[PDB]
Ligand binder design. Sequence first.
Ligand code: FMI
Length: 294
Amino acid sequence: TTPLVHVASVEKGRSYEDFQKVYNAIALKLREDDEYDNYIGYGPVLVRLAWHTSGTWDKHDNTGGSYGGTYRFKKEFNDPSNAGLQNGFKFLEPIHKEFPWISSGDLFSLGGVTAVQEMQGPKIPWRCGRVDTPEDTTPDNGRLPDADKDADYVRTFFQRLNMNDREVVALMGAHALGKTHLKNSGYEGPWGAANNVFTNEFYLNLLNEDWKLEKNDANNEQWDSKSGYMMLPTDYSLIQDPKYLSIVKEYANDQDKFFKDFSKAFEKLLENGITFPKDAPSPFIFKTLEEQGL
Ligand code: FMI
């Protein structure tokens, strides 16, 4: 029961070039399967997948986390909190088939990095080495957060993932991506207009839109704006709490600062629970398809 240690182990003989190839395959498929979710594309769901497979981590005993790639097991696969992520997993299936040597954890996390970068977000340094672990290492459902709570809940919840106020506010900025789907979470609507482009729009919308607390078709409360945008109760709590509000304003006024902070927090999130040997490769920074002329 003692807190186990997960040491990163580089996939046998693999290096930067090998992972850039996986990144490219993911990016090329993101470009090809552009019709998904009313042309939003698979970018957003891949980011959510990367986060959900990492967000089960508990700093107290190092259980859960991105290391094991346990989402491939039924218990986690069927977590109500992961409803809808099967689309992301299906997307990665052909990728894993072409590169069977990559671990599940590395693939799930790399999918998130690839999505953010291809959607014009900041570069996210990424490290390889996650190793698949047995089905009995799969964390129980209920470790992922709820969206119907307030700022105090958010702050306390994220302490389990060792994230502070700035890290939490920065991570939530990813909600500029995709949308909520009534069938998956009991919420409906997008947070903004640039559904598949990574920008700081989440913060601008929180501050500039005229929000009204309404009930959706699932009988859940959510904040709506005449522009057709929505915010979860937890999203809105970021402007209700004075400390979170200050940070929201900072990111709404500094795109570069948001990109830099999100990059650090996202990499941290994807690496929580992993021990990287002193002589492990330095983090990889993958070139986008655009940068490669592909
Ligand atoms: C890594 C960034 C990130 C973080 C940190 C983070 C944190 C948290 N998220 Fe969020 N998320 C991200 C990225 C990130 N999210 C993305 C990209 C989406 C869009 C998914 C899609 O469009 O398919 C979504 C969609 C989504 C939805 C709609 C799901 C659906 O109906 O398909 C809900 C209800 C929530 C709830 C919550 C919280 C508030 C409760 C778990 C929360 O704490 N999210």
